[PDB]
């Protein structure tokens, strides 16, 4: 599907082909004039004509160089703009795919798609058509001219041409499968490198470099690269030798010297072959080296278009405040593997709902379904009576705030992390949000204050980054708040303080709390026990204790 | 080019010398074959054209020799490129686990990612694709100019004067676009890091509505990358124009000297006609170097990143070892002081943990109790003071003896993308199935194997993202328990577990058959029931310590902590 992706570039590509045909003819023009200059030199022409021909040939060389440079510059600008707009399209597309796409693919695959696949289209849309047009125009024009000159010496020029064609075909056939396998290997190596960098504590404690799968995969990938590039480079170098101007000149002279000797040919008739017979080999080698780039670009275009055609979280056209309802919701991350089984639940304003249960029961995925990171398999999730599939991302996420179980921080200042949902928020808002989340004092102790960057190696403790994300959710200030195991890394005192701050802030809001520390959720208006992906009992703390069910078992285990 | 010779393996130096010799031979053969046309065409246009047979024979010999030399140069360049690739990548893989944690800034992380990402066919084909054609093109017109001295001294001098402007243009081409290429590389690296962040942090960015390009950081990075790339395209024009003008000046000098010698009668007309072809051969390297100029700067950036990773400061180490056969050692802190940058983390912390006992470390968030475990494990080294394992300073231990002593459960469990059993087997890849089953049962991973459809063959995502928090936490606990180390460091290993799993795992950690010196960190009182001793860490100093009953009865900070 590389024709559908590159359809916007039809007119530039056709224009580049036509202009390259003209530029190739202009670049061949000086050597015809040099052939005439040599013929006039042998005939002892007057200095005027010789100066005219020489100056015209030099000026035509300069003109051809300038035109080639201009076409290359224009075509590279066209390629850069196409890459930029295609990358923008890919970033727009990924912004509304299901999160399962990301979880299945990984960060390395996303990086490969957005950067390396778009970069792999460069040869196809910048050099391929010009190289093909040059490699067709120059050999054909030169060979017609030389056959008109002398067919006997022009026939031996087919020998290197036919050898080159056979080498090019064999190289393409031999390397076709390895080019297909190459992007998979690059994605695997990027993933292994990313895991090696991210899992450095695990690597250091458990086995170091020797036992790491990164080293084994690195060896396997170097083996693949050698098995790919050894015969490929061998064919590439043979093609360089066969098409080289020295080779053509030597073949021309081996054919012509025995003809000039013995009188079968006039030596003046060798001048076209000496001056033009060696010009078209490089243009042939251009496509010969380019056929791999064409395959790479077509495969990259296929991958890009396949991602652009992927089904996404479309906003339906169907089209109490603060209420979240789940109506017989079911969900499966993978087909035939249910994780949520016909869950019905209602969250109302001014109430706190505690969602508890065994680890792995499906609390985080229920929260992710409310976020519409995935679409429910059955049922519907309605916020203020409107199905979330009818809301836009902006409308949905202005209404529901989320503190996720993993405390993800972006590369930037602590202010930029706290103000992630509202980047144009005042520093006073950021400071009061941090004070509510019990992280203002720590930030004040940092060297740069609120401008200190949160990158790799400049991290915080687990509780501190958790409180940063809690401050982010506080600053977002949505009518509905979903707290996914927040305060899990918090000590009891800071946990109590941030919980009191949240209770003060979300007193009239809809709050969903996921907790394993059941002692922290005894004051909830409603407690929902999620076991094996379904709600098994609902009630208050005292009611669930008196019921003597799953909740009583978990409570007894906790004490 | 000395940076590349630095990266060559020591056993491959003979191949580099042979490659240099054969490259010089290839250039000399090409230059001689170009200039041999002048005698050949002078003889072919004379009254005795049969004199061209000798020069045609010499041309055939030089051409066949050039074919053989260039094939061998290609083979040697391929071998050198892949040997250098293997050596550099293996060196970076071996060095990175030993590099200090402070080195891994976001810039250094990006540099290391790029250096590892250079493993593809572009860097491996460095010698064949860049150095061989660059050296051939740079030296060819010099070799032609030298070979023309045997035809005419002033003509060879004119050719060499053309080579002078060739080298001047080649030197000046880099300067005219160094800044643009540097900015382009920086913005490309920033875009790569923002793409990786965009993929990893997708949920939080979507919830924050920071996911569209107009509002995302990756969108800003894309805009900056595009602007820098356009600027690089514009700023590469002066170098191309400079190479073109150098070629035109060399053409003017060569052709003018040839015409002057021809009209003066010192050069024959057939020799001038052959010199047209020699001039065409002479000017081809001018365009080749112009084509190769950007690749030289790209290769320079790549090798700079690789050398930056190879120059990273490796942690201090030694050669000591623990004598006993994996017996539980004592853990001692001796005036240990640690700081992240200028922020002090530990203030002269001193304690001794008896061999084989279970110790608990508790305290507020940010008090340094993860730093204590990292110092015990050797992930971090003290700024001053000593960490001793059985009386042996950890900094003086061999790296293999150091890691073989400690197994760790980290606060934020990280699993590698793969099967669940592969992640558990990281603790001990040689463990028999019974030991792996025991480790999984102790960590309550056996529940997952029946709940999940694929069992222990379940594909874990990047990190443990295809599992829940408690599931990946239990998998990491199984990994830590599988390792037969005499020291076990537990860092809030029940944070993501419900009460039943928490109690089961807490009992299992104490019920591990082998003797270990166990240090536990937890914010739950129920997670430290089996702790013989407790350390209360606050603001980087041990406020109090003792037994749980003693500390509870004391009514100190420990009692207020759980109040
Ligand atoms: N990479 C780092 N760079 C700078 N400071 C850091 C880094 N990692 C941790 N710190 C700081 O070290 C101090 C102690 O960190 P540590 O991780 O040991 O805390 P902790 O007691 O384990 O906390 P928690 O209970 O929240 O997990 C904190 O102030 C944290 O800000
Ligand atoms: N991306 C995913 N792909 C496949 N399965 C997944 C994915 N994320 C979660 N699961 C599975 O979904 C089930 C429930 O996961 P979830 O994270 O919702 O549980 P949880 O109740 O929040 O767990 P915990 O309390 O341990 O955090 C688990 O079996 C987990 O393996
Ligand atoms: Mg979860
Ligand atoms: Mg910690
Ligand atoms: Zn290009």
Contact, A53 vs B284, CB < 8 A? Answer: no
Which residues on chain A are in Cβ contact (under 8 Å) with B206? 95, 99, 371, 373, 393, 397
Domain ranges of chain A: 2-308, 324-558
Helix/strand/coil for B5: helix
Q: How many C-beta atoms surround the C-beta of residue A202 within 10 A? A: 23
- Do A324-558 and A2-308 have the same topology in CATH? no
What CATH topology corresponds to B2-177+236-310? ABC transporter transmembrane region fold (1.20.1560)
Would you call A7 exposed, middle or buried from its count of C-beta atoms within 10 A (0-12, 13-18, 19+)? Answer: exposed
Cα gap B374→B221, rounded to integer Å: 35
- The torsion defined by the Cα of B548, B553, B555 and B560, in degrees rounded to 10, comes to 40
In sequence order, what DSSP letters do the residues of A267-316 get, joined into one string? GGGGHHHHHHTTTSHHHHHHHHHHHHHHHHHHHHHHHHHHHHTS------
Among A111, A357, A402, select the one facing B192 at the smallest CB separation: A111
Crossing angle of helices A128-149 and A281-308, rounded to 10°: 150
The CA R_g of chain B, rounded to the nearest whole Å, is 34
Contact, B475 vs B443, CB < 8 A? Answer: yes
Does A356 touch chain B if contact means CB atoms closer than 8 Å? yes
Contact, A195 vs B417, CB < 8 A? Answer: yes
User: Residue B120's closest CA among B289, B311, B302, B296?
Assistant: B302
Best residue in A60, A446, A516 to probe B by mutation, most B CBs within 10 Å? A516
Does A2 touch chain B if contact means CB atoms closer than 8 Å? no
Give CA separation, B154 vs A224, B28, B160, B161, B444, in Å: 53, 20, 10, 10, 88
Tell whether ligand 1 has an atom less than 6 A from the beta carbon of residue A462: yes
Give CA separation, A179 vs A183, A222, B81, B90, in Å: 8, 15, 20, 24
Which residues sit with Cβ closer than 5 angstroms to ligand 3, an ion?
A: A 364, 405; B 468-469
User: Residue B85's closest CA among B7, B150, B165?
Assistant: B7
In this structure, chain B runs to a length of 563
Would you call A170 exposed, middle or buried from its count of C-beta atoms within 10 A (0-12, 13-18, 19+)? Answer: middle
Contact, A312 vs A97, CB < 8 A? Answer: yes
Give CA separation, B8 vs B1, B123, B296, B385, in Å: 11, 13, 18, 40
Does B48 touch chain A if contact means CB atoms closer than 8 Å? no
User: Residue A258's closest CA among A146, A145, A152, A144?
Assistant: A152
Largest CA distance in chain B: 122
Residues 454 through 493 of chain A touching chain B, CB cutoff 8 Å: 455-458, 460-464, 467, 469, 472, 476, 485, 488-493
Give CA separation, B131 vs A241, B12, B128, B143, in Å: 17, 17, 6, 17
Beta bridge partners of A481: A401, A511
Resolution in A: 2.5
Contacts of A63 (CB under 8 A, 6+ apart): A26
Would you call A483 exposed, middle or buried from its count of C-beta atoms within 10 A (0-12, 13-18, 19+)? Answer: buried
Beta bridge partners of A495: none
Question: Residues A380-383: contacts with CB within 8 Å, 24+ apart?
Answer: A380/A326, A380/A327, A380/A329, A381/A324, A381/A325, A381/A326, A381/A327, A381/A329, A382/A323, A382/A324, A382/A325, A382/A327, A383/A323, A383/A324, A383/A325, A383/A480
User: Under CATH, which number does the domain A2-308 receive?
Assistant: 1.20.1560.10
Q: Which two tokens stand for residue A331?
A: 């969900």
> Of A461, A468, A491, which is best to mutate to test ligand 1, by the most ligand atoms within 8 angstroms of its C-beta?
A461
Cα gap A527→A537, rounded to integer Å: 8
Q: Is residue A348 within a helix (H) or strand (E), and if so which, with residue range?
A: none
Q: Is B182 one of the annotated binding-site residues?
A: no
Which residue lies with its CA nearest to atom 8 of ligand 2? Answer: B466
CA–centroid distance, residue A389 to ligand 4 (Å): 39
Cα gap B65→B71, rounded to integer Å: 10
Contact, B488 vs B407, CB < 8 A? Answer: yes
**Pairing verdict, β A324-334 and A400-403:** unpaired
In sequence order, what DSSP letters do the residues of B491-525 get, joined into one string? ESTTTT--HHHHHHHHHHHHT-SS--EEEEE-S-G
The domain covering B331-561 belongs, at the CATH homologous superfamily level, to P-loop containing nucleotide triphosphate hydrolases (3.40.50.300)
User: Residue A81's closest CA among B187, B240, B233, B293?
Assistant: B233
Q: What CATH architecture does domain A324-558 belong to?
A: 3-Layer(aba) Sandwich (3.40)
Contact, B210 vs A423, CB < 8 A? Answer: yes
Cα gap B189→B304, rounded to integer Å: 14
**Exposure class string for A11-33: b at 16+ Cβ within 10 A, else e:** ebbeebbebbbebbebbbbbbbb
Q: Which two tokens stand for residue B186?
A: 């920086």
Residue A121: what are its φ and ψ, rounded to 5°? Answer: -80, 0
Give CA separation, B203 vs A97, A100, A401, A402, in Å: 11, 11, 12, 9
- The torsion defined by the Cα of B317, B323, B329 and B330, in degrees rounded to 10, comes to -70
CA–centroid distance, residue B46 to ligand 5 (Å): 47
Nearest CA distance, A193 vs chain B (angstrom): 7
Contacts of B511 (CB under 8 A, 6+ apart): B442
**CA A142 from chain center: how many Å?**
44
Contact, B388 vs B334, CB < 8 A? Answer: yes
Cα gap B453→B467, rounded to integer Å: 13
**Three-state secondary structure readout of A204-272:** HHCCCCCCCHHHHHHHHHHHHHHHHHHHHHHHHHHHHHHCCHHHHHHHHHHHHHHHHHHHCCCHHHHHH
Sign of the four-CA dihedral A412, A417, A423, A424? negative
Contact, B545 vs B534, CB < 8 A? Answer: yes
Residue A539: what are its φ and ψ, rounded to 5°? Answer: 170, -170
User: Residue B302's closest CA among B536, B129, B474?
Assistant: B129
| Upper half-sphere CA count for residue B531 (Cβ side, 13 Å) | 28
Largest CA distance in chain A: 120
Cα gap B27→B22, rounded to integer Å: 9
Which residues on chain B are in Cβ contact (under 8 Å) with A61? 251
CA–centroid distance, residue B374 to ligand 4 (Å): 10
Sign of the four-CA dihedral B506, B509, B512, B514? negative
Domain ranges of chain B: 2-177+236-310, 180-235, 331-561
Crossing angle of helices B106-117 and B178-200, rounded to 10°: 100
Contacts of A147 (CB under 8 A, 6+ apart): A154
**Three-state secondary structure readout of A156-167:** HCHHHHHHHHHH
Q: Angle at CA B494, nearest 5°, toward B490 and B496?
A: 130
Q: Which two tokens stand for residue B405?
A: 């002593």
Contact, B402 vs B379, CB < 8 A? Answer: no
Residue A486: what are its φ and ψ, rounded to 5°? Answer: -65, 150
**Exposure class string for A488-521: b at 16+ Cβ within 10 A, else e:** bbbbbebbebbbebbeebbeebbbbbbbbbbebb
Helix/strand/coil for B396: helix
Beta bridge partners of B533: B359
Contacts of B115 (CB under 8 A, 6+ apart): B92, B302, B305, B306, B308, B309
Which residue lies with its CA nearest to atom 30 of ligand 2? Answer: B467
Asked whether the beta carbons of residue A196 and residue B116 sit closer than 8 angstroms, the reply is: yes
Cα gap B428→B157, rounded to integer Å: 71
Q: Is residue A123 within a helix (H) or strand (E), and if so which, with residue range?
A: helix A122-126
Tell how many helices (H) and how many strands (E) occur in chain B. Answer: 23, 12
Crossing angle of helices B52-95 and B269-310, rounded to 10°: 10
Cα gap B102→B95, rounded to integer Å: 15
């Amino acid at each position: 599907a590389g024709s559908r992706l590159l359809a916007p570039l039809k007119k530039p590509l056709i224009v580049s082909g036509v202009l390259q045909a003209l530029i190739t003819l202009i670049e061949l023009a000086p050597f015809v004039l040099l052939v005439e200059l040599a013929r006039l030199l042998l005939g002892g022409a007057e200095a005027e004509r010789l100066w005219t021909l020489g100056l015209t040939a030099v000026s035509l060389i300069g003109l051809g160089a300038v035109l080639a440079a201009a076409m290359t510059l224009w075509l590279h600008r066209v390629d850069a703009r196409f890459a930029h707009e295609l990358r923008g399209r890919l970033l727009t597309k990924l912004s509304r795919l299901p999160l399962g796409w990301f979880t299945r693919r990984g960060s390395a695959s996303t990086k490969q798609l957005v950067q390396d696949d778009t970069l792999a289209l460069h040869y196809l849309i910048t050099h391929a058509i010009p190289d093909a047009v040059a490699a067709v125009v120059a050999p054909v024009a030169v060979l017609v001219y030389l056959f008109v000159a002398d067919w006997r010496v022009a026939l031996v020029l087919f020998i290197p041409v036919l050898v080159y064609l056979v080498l090019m075909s064999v190289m393409t056939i031999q390397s076709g499968s390895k080019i297909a396998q190459a992007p998979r290997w690059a994605e695997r190596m990027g993933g292994e490198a990313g895991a090696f960098l991210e899992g450095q504590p695990v690597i250091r404690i458990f086995g170091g470099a020797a036992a790491s799968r990164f080293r084994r995969r690195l060896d396997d990938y170097i083996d693949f690269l050698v098995s790919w590039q050894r015969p490929f480079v061998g064919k590439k170098t043979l093609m360089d030798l066969v098409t080289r101007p020295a080779t053509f000149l030597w073949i021309i002279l081996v054919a012509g010297v025995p003809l000039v000797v013995t009188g079968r040919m006039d030596p003046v008739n060798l001048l076209p072959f000496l001056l033009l017979g060696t010009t078209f080999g490089a243009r042939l080698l251009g496509i010969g080296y380019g056929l791999s780039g064409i395959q790479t670009g077509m495969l990259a275009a296929r991958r890009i278009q396949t991602v652009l055609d992927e089904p996404e979280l479309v906003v339906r056209d169907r089209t109490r405040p603060g209420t979240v309802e789940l109506d017989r919701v079911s969900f499966e991350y993978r087909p035939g593997v249910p994780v949520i089984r016909d869950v019905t639940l209602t969250l109302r304003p001014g109430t706190v709902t505690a969602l508890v249960g065994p680890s792995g029961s499906g609390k985080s995925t229920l929260a992710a379904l409310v976020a519409r990171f995935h679409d429910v398999t059955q049922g519907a999730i309605r916020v203020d009576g409107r199905d979330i599939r009818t809301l836009t991302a902006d409308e949905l996420y202005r209404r529901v705030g989320f503190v996720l179980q993993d405390a993800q921080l972006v590369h930037g200042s602590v202010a930029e992390n706290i103000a992630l949902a509202e980047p144009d928020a005042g520093l006073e808002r950021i400071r009061t949000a941090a004070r509510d989340a019990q992280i203002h004092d720590r930030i004040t102790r940092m060297p740069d204050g609120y401008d200190s960057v949160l990158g790799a190696g400049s991290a915080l403790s687990g509780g501190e980054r958790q409180r940063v994300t809690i401050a982010r959710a506080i600053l977002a200030d949505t009518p509905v708040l979903v707290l996914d195991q927040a305060t899990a890394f918090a000590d009891p005192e800071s946990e109590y303080l941030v919980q009191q701050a949240i209770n003060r802030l979300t007193r009239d809001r809809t709050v969903l709390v996921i907790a394993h520390r059941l002692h922290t959720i005894t004051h909830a208006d409603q407690i929902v026990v999620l076991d094996d992906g379904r709600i098994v009992e609902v009630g208050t703390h005292d009611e669930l204790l008196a019921a003597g069910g799953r909740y009583r078992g978990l409570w007894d285990s906790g004490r | 080019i000395r940076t590349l010779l630095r990266l060559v393996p020591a056993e491959k130096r003979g191949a580099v010398a042979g490659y240099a010799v054969l490259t010089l031979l290839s250039v000399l053969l090409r230059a001689v074959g170009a200039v041999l046309l002048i005698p050949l065409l002078a003889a072919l246009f004379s009254d005795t054209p049969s004199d061209a047979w000798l020069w045609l024979g010499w041309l055939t010999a030089v051409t066949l020799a050039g074919w053989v030399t260039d094939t061998n140069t290609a083979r040697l360049g391929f071998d050198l490129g892949f040997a250098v690739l293997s050596r550099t990548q293996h060196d970076m893989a071996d060095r990175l686990p030993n590099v200090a944690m402070s080195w891994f800034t976001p810039d250094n992380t990006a540099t290391a990612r790029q250096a590892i990402a250079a493993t593809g066919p572009e860097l491996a084909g460095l010698v064949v694709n860049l150095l061989t054609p660059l050296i051939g093109a740079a030296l060819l017109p010099a070799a032609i100019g030298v070979a023309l001295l045997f035809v005419s001294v002033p003509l060879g001098l004119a050719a060499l004067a053309g080579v002078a402007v060739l080298f001047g243009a080649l030197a000046l081409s880099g300067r005219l676009s160094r800044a643009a290429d540097k900015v382009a590389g920086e913005t490309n690296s920033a875009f790569t890091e923002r793409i990786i962040e965009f993929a990893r942090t997708q949920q939080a960015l979507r919830a924050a509505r920071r996911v569209e390009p107009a509002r995302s950081q990756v969108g800003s990075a894309l805009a900056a990358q595009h602007g820098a790339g356009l600027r690089l395209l514009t700023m590469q024009i002066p170098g191309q124009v400079l190479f073109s003008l150098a070629g035109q000046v060399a053409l003017i000098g060569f052709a003018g000297m040839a015409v002057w010698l021809t009209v003066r009668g010192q050069l024959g007309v057939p020799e001038a006609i052959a010199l047209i072809v020699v001039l065409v051969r002479y000017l081809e390297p001018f365009a080749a170097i112009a084509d190769l100029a950007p690749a030289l700067e790209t290769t320079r950036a790549t090798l700079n990143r690789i050398q930056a990773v190879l120059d990273a400061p490796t942690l201090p180490a030694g050669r000591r070892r623990l004598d006993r056969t994996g017996a539980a050692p004592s853990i001692e802190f001796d005036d240990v002081r640690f700081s992240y940058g200028d922020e002090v983390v530990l203030d002269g912390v001193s304690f001794t943990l008896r061999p084989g006992n279970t110790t608990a470390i508790v305290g507020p968030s940010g008090s340094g109790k993860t730093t204590i475990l990292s110092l015990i494990a050797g992930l971090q080294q003290p700024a001053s003071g000593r960490v001793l394992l059985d009386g042996v300073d950890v900094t003086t231990l061999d790296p293999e003896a150091r890691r073989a002593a400690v197994s760790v459960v980290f606060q934020h469990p990280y699993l590698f993308d793969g099967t669940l059993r592969d992640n558990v087997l990281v603790g001990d890849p040689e463990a028999d199935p019974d030991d792996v089953t025991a480790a999984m049962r102790l960590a309550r991973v056996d529940e997952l194997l029946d709940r999940l459809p694929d069992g222990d063959a379940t594909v874990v995502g990047e990190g443990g993202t295809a599992l829940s928090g408690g599931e990946r936490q239990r998998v990491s606990i199984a990994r830590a328990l599988l390792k037969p180390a005499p020291v076990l460091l537990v860092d809030q290993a029940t944070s993501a577990l419900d009460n039943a799993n928490e109690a089961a795992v807490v009992d299992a950690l104490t019920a591990d058959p082998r003797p270990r010196t166990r240090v536990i960190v937890a914010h739950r009182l129920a997670s430290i029931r089996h702790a013989d001793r407790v350390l209360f860490v606050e603001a980087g100093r041990v406020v109090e310590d003792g037994a749980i009953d003693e500390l509870l009865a004391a009514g100190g900070r420990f009692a207020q902590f759980w109040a």
